[PDB]
Amino acid sequence: QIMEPHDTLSPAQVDEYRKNGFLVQEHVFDEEEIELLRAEAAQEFASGGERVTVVRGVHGCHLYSEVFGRLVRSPRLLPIARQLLRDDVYVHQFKINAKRAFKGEVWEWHQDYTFWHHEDGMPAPRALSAAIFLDEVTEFNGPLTFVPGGHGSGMIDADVKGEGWANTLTASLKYSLDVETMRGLIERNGMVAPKGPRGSVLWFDANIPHSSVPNISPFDRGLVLITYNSVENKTDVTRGTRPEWLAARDFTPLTALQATSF
Amino acid sequence: QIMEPHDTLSPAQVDEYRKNGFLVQEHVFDEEEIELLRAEAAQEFASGGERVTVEQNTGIVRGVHGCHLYSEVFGRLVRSPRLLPIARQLLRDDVYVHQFKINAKRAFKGEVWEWHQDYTFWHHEDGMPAPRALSAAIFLDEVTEFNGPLTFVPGGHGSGMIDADVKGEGWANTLTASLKYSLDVETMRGLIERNGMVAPKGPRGSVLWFDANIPHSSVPNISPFDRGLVLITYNSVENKTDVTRGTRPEWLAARDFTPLTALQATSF
Ligand code: PRO
Numbered sequence: 001q002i003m004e005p006h007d008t009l010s011p012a013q014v015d016e017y018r019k020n021g022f023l024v025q026e027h028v029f030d031e032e033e034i035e036l037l038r039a040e041a042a043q044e045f046a047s048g049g050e051r052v053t054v055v056r057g058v059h060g061c062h063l064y065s066e067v068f069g070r071l072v073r074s075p076r077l078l079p080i081a082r083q084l085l086r087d088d089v090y091v092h093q094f095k096i097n098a099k100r101a102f103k104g105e106v107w108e109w110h111q112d113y114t115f116w117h118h119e120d121g122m123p124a125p126r127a128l129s130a131a132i133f134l135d136e137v138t139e140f141n142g143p144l145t146f147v148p149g150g151h152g153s154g155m156i157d158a159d160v161k162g163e164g165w166a167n168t169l170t171a172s173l174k175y176s177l178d179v180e181t182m183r184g185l186i187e188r189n190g191m192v193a194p195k196g197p198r199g200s201v202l203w204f205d206a207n208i209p210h211s212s213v214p215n216i217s218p219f220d221r222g223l224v225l226i227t228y229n230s231v232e233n234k235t236d237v238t239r240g241t242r243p244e245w246l247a248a249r250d251f252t253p254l255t256a257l258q259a260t261s262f
Numbered sequence: 263q264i265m266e267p268h269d270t271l272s273p274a275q276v277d278e279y280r281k282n283g284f285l286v287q288e289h290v291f292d293e294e295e296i297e298l299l300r301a302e303a304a305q306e307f308a309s310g311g312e313r314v315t316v317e318q319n320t321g322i323v324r325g326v327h328g329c330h331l332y333s334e335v336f337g338r339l340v341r342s343p344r345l346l347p348i349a350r351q352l353l354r355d356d357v358y359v360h361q362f363k364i365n366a367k368r369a370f371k372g373e374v375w376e377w378h379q380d381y382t383f384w385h386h387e388d389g390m391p392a393p394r395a396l397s398a399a400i401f402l403d404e405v406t407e408f409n410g411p412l413t414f415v416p417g418g419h420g421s422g423m424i425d426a427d428v429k430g431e432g433w434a435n436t437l438t439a440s441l442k443y444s445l446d447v448e449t450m451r452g453l454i455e456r457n458g459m460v461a462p463k464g465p466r467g468s469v470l471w472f473d474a475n476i477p478h479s480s481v482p483n484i485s486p487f488d489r490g491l492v493l494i495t496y497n498s499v500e501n502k503t504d505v506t507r508g509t510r511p512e513w514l515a516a517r518d519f520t521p522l523t524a525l526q527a528t529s530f
């Protein structure tokens with residue numbers, strides 16, 4: 001049996017990712033693959049316990065689901081994560097954010113790296129996320145929205161609340177960026193809400209500022225977000241304040257899935 | 263502590279490798295690094311027992327095989343971030359070491375490596391199913407016109423596996439001036455009449471990457487200068503050898519197909 005030889009990003013693609021801080025590959029996974037992933041997302045939402053947020057999200061699924069454990073090692077994903085981070089990689093965080101059709105809430109503006117630095121002791125922004133589109137992403141279903149190029153200022157300040165981790169993945173974020181600081185960013189750089197079909201992957205930088213609106217449409221916007229971190233860039237588990245299902249502690253380099261008879 | 267971020271080949275370098283079947287990177291390893299590998303190789307030639315090979319005219323060391331399984335330095339070398347990312351890149355897979363060898367081609371007495379394709383041996387002796395494998399040749403010495411460089415038919419990998427005369431049962435003659443599978447002189451001449459011959463050169467510390475199926479050879483070294491090469495053969499994990507048609511020991515043909523991971527920078 002045969003896995004297709006690993007495909008990496010073109011030099012132009014890499015350049016676009018570096019410039020903008022994000023990049024879309026369309027139709028990475030086919031419909032049958034996507035349906036498998038949706039079914040498993042549904043299992044995880046139904047049985048996740050304390051790993052579910054209210055359903056707003058579920059976290060850490062690759063540690064509990066075999067299908068998700070295999071996904072993060074996929075030859076469609078792992079080679080590009082390696083290429084972009086220029087290292088072996090492991091999964092820092094895994095989450096599925098079901099931005100539900102009628103009543104799907106905001107994600108206020110944030111840089112993931114701000115959270116991961118302060119909550120988990122990640123030392124540099126040498127990480128990225130791959131967001132798999134379980135549904136078509138349009139203007140109307142609350143797309144992920146970015147300031148392009150906004151990753152190249154490093155972190156930028158954000159006020160904190162809670163002496164806990166509970167408010168890290170709510171509508172009200174622990175480290176959001178204020179109206180003024182965003183107005184600045186937006187006035188200079190733009191806003192972009194990249195779009196795509198079911199099965200696409202949206203790659204984005206740990207430090208790019210991003211957000212998403214409420215879901216207007218009658219349509220869902222299920223995303224599977226896999227955060228790859230550089231093994232060299234492993235988080236300092238002695239600054240770590242969160243469970244494994246939010247911030248991994250096993251830094252074993254991932255290997256790609258090979259084709260087997262089962 | 264920090265390893266330099268993984269460097270891979272440019273698209274132009276990769277196009278050159280696929281077209282010619284070989285590619286030189288100059289000055290990959292520095293002098294101090296080469297010197298560590300030189301000293302470890304001297305240790306393996308002195309302690310490798312059955313894994314050592316001698317030139318016929320003499321008792322002088324021709325080569326030692328399998329050192330990554332016995333030497334910790336060599337076990338780490340194959341995982342080096344100067345090497346592993348490029349092997350993964352060119353083979354478009356995770357990889358593992360099929361074969362490891364050090365070929366000391368001494369200053370006045372190194373003998374011939376007759377024309378051959380590595381893949382022919384690996385396919386028939388070891389059960390490698392396709393030529394999705396490559397060798398990285400580390401130059402422990404400057405490779406010049408005069409110290410018996412590996413010499414290739416550029417582009418000769420792309421007309422598949424050429425047919426060769428088998429000589430005998432088993433494998434001891436896979437490592438000799440007398441090769442088990444050497445090439446039909448009439449097809450050699452053909453290959454060469456249409457493709458030519460090239461002996462890549464470079465300074466100490468360079469790496470010469472070459473395709474598993476590229477016809478290659480080397481002449482004797484009659485310079486006053488050694489040509490020590492550390493040759494690491496990476497194979498794609500998908501392309502793992504069929505260990506059920508395998509005729510040779512571990513130190514010629516690996517059986518552990520665990521994907522290699524890169525060495526990280528630690529405090530020791
Ligand atoms: O707490 C976290 O790490 C994720 C990333 C930003 C939103 N929630």
Ligand code: PRO
Pocket residue numbers: 361378379380383384436437
């Ligand atoms: O026997 C082998 O496997 C190597 C490749 C060709 C010459 N010796």
Ligand SMILES: [O]
Pocket residue numbers: 378379380478
């Ligand atoms: O060879």
